[PDB]
Amino acid sequence: KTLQQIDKLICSWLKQIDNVIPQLIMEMTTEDLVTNVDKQIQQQFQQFLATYFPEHQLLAEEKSNAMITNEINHLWIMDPIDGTANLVKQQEDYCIILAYFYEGKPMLSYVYDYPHKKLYKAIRGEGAFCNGFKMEEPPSLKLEDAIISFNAQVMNLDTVQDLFDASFSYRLVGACGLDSMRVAKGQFGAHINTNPKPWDIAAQFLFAELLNLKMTTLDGKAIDHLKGAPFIISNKACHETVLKILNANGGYQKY
Amino acid sequence: TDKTLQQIDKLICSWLKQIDNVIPQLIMEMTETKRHRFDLVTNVDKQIQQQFQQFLATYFPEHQLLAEEKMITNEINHLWIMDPIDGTANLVKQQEDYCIILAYFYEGKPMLSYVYDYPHKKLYKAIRGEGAFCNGFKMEEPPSLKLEDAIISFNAQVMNLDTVQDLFDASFSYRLVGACGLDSMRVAKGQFGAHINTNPKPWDIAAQFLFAELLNLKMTTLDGKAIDHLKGAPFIISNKACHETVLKILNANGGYQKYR
Ligand SMILES: O=P([O-])([O-])O[C@@H]1[C@H](O)[C@H](O)[C@H](O)[C@H](O)[C@H]1O
Ligand SMILES: O=P([O-])([O-])O[C@@H]1[C@H](O)[C@H](O)[C@H](O)[C@H](O)[C@H]1O
Ligand SMILES: [Ca+2]
Ligand SMILES: [Ca+2]
Ligand SMILES: [Ca+2]
Ligand SMILES: [Ca+2]
Ligand SMILES: [Cl-]
Ligand SMILES: [Cl-]
Q1: With an 8 Å Cβ cutoff, are B34 and A145 in contact?
Q2: Nearest C-alpha of chain B: how many angstroms from A152?
Q3: Are B172 and B89 found together in one domain?
Q4: Are A169 and B94 within 8 A, CB to CB?
Q5: A182 DSSP β-pair partners
Q6: Which of A174, B58, B122, B189 has the smallest count of CB within 10 Å of its CB?
Q7: Do B53 and B130 have their domain in common?
């Protein structure tokens, strides 16, 4: 019922999920990738919800979501594995993403970096935490002093060049959730994804609010958690400059 | 010589273990915040290096050190190459994704190599006669990776963009950890197909020789030649199945260099 109660349940389900994943990985089979691991984690969470919060609905990657509307009171958004490519190719640098919305308002968020056993969580009224230790607003980062992260394969190269020249350096973890959390931790100045699904960014809203980060569309607007949009999550001090570079000279999209 | 590889290895491992007692403090000191990529400090680099110099004074006093933060005979018997922090930018900006690199050469022959991923407490080591290990578990030759099925890693800011584009189109995807030692180990583990560094120093690649030999990796110049461990050269470390294709792309259409 309370946020703490729901949080305690989710944290224990995530803990138990450590006991399932090594096996799924040992038998890993695959099919824009999708494994058994994605599907099984998702199904288990569906069953978890049937069992504890049976009014609650799920918007997730591996299910049809036709039934999900503007007015659902209790909504979870899930990415059961974000970074499937990294899971398959590296068995590292992937995460589980969850977010609970109450009447459209972010209340709980989770990014579980399972390979490193690092649970990032955010709780409206309490704050954000990594394995329990409170996260603080990161230091201010101007773009020239910041590392930035984005997919350079989906942008035109003049714009990529401008991002390179204006920033301290460039890195890529390769999972939206984890690259986002590096912004949250102050390790990156900003992460960009030019075409995310609602589940790629759903947890990030509450993190951005509680840690004073900017999270907007690439036009600087509020994002609908129900609909993807081109997006950025950014340190407050470099947000404007990134958007200016992205939108200059007819924009960032490949010619 | 005189000490066996096991004896030397034991001492390096115990030094590296005591280094866990030093690093948290060095990091606690150290916040800025306006020097660019090329102009970084730190005291962490310098202190780790000084301590290793004391370690050698103390145990292997014949041994010499070629290191970043500090060569008169061509033919040194006992040589260590060190990068006390590889990934200084990541240390400063992220406090993650950096490593300590050490490589011992006996009469110019790689005998011991270490890449210590300290933030994750993962010690990658290679020992001539034993094999390569991660925290003790033996590393095997990685599966074959064709370039189209492989993640590759390189600095995209230092190559011309057409060649960067060609590398994107031909590989499965692109990632960057941002420390030569760690990006290289991802090749060693089979996580990446290849890592490129177009201008490394001897310390950036010194450990990698022995890893590439023991795990059947290709490590060459970008012209496909053997590298002198004493002298940097533009380099690639690669899975055997994607090495040729990477070099072909890099050298195609007049080459990879940005301002040519
Ligand atoms: O497919 P998936 O691994 O869940 O999600 C992807 C990752 O977050 C990745 O970093 C990329 O940028 C894509 O935009 C996402 O679709
Ligand atoms: O300065 P440092 O962090 O020891 O070493 C650097 C890192 O390995 C980095 O990834 C980069 O590619 C440079 O080539 C190196 O100079
Ligand atoms: Ca996914
Ligand atoms: Ca995703
Ligand atoms: Ca260094
Ligand atoms: Ca280095
Ligand atoms: Cl700025
Ligand atoms: Cl190939």
Answers
A1: yes
A2: 9
A3: no
A4: no
A5: none
A6: B58
A7: yes
Residue B121: give its domain's CATH number.
3.30.540.10
Contact predicate A211/A128, CB 8 Å: yes
Maximum pairwise Cα distance, chain A = 53
Contact (Cβ atoms closer than 8 angstroms) between residue B229 and residue B202: yes
Domain co-membership, B48 together with B166: no
The response to whether residue B67 sits with its C-beta less than 6 Å from ligand 2 reads: no
Q: Which of A90, A147, A174 sits opposite B93 (nearest CB)?
A: A147
Q: Give the C-alpha separation, B206 to B228, whole Å.
A: 10
B174 touches chain A (CB under 8 A): yes
Tokens 């010499």 — which residue? B64
In a shared domain, residues A175 and A123: no
Give me the count of residues in chain B: 260
Nominal resolution (angstroms): 2.5
* Cα B16 versus chain centre, distance: 16
Domain's final residue, options B107, B140, B173 = B140
Its sign, for the CA torsion B98, B104, B108, B111, is negative
Residues B228 and B133 in one domain: no
* Ligand 2 centroid to residue B38 C-alpha, Å: 10
> Is B128 found in the same domain as B31?
yes
Domain count, chain B: 2
Question: Quick one: B32 and B122 in the same domain?
Answer: yes
The whole-angstrom separation of Cα A123 and Cα A105 is 12
DSSP codes of every residue in chain A: --HHHHHHHHHHHHHHHHHHHHHHHHT--B----BHHHHHHHHHHHHHHHHH-TT-EEEETTS--TT--TT-SEEEEEEEEE-HHHHHHHS-S-EEEEEEEETTEEEEEEEEETTTTEEEEEETTTEEEETTEEP-PPPP--GGG-EEEE-GGGB-HHHHHHHHHHSSEE-B-S-HHHHHHHHHTTSSSEEEESS--HHHHTTHHHHHHHTT-EEEETTSPPPPTTS---EEEE-TTTHHHHHHHHHGGG-SB--
Kindly determine whether residue A169 and residue B177, on different chains, have CB atoms separated by under 8 Å.
no
Q: What is the CATH number of the domain that holds B258?
A: 3.40.190.80
Exp. method? X-ray
- Domain boundary (A98, A116, A136) is at A136
Contacts by A7-14, CB closer than 8 A, 24 or more apart: A7/A108, A7/A121, A7/A123, A9/A48, A9/A52, A10/A98, A10/A108, A10/A110, A11/A119, A11/A121, A13/A44, A13/A45, A13/A48, A14/A96, A14/A110, A14/A112, A14/A119
Whole domain around residue B113: which residue ranges? 1-140
Q: In whole angstroms, what is the distance from residue B161 CA to residue B156 CA?
A: 8
Domain check: are B116 and B149 in the same one?
Answer: no
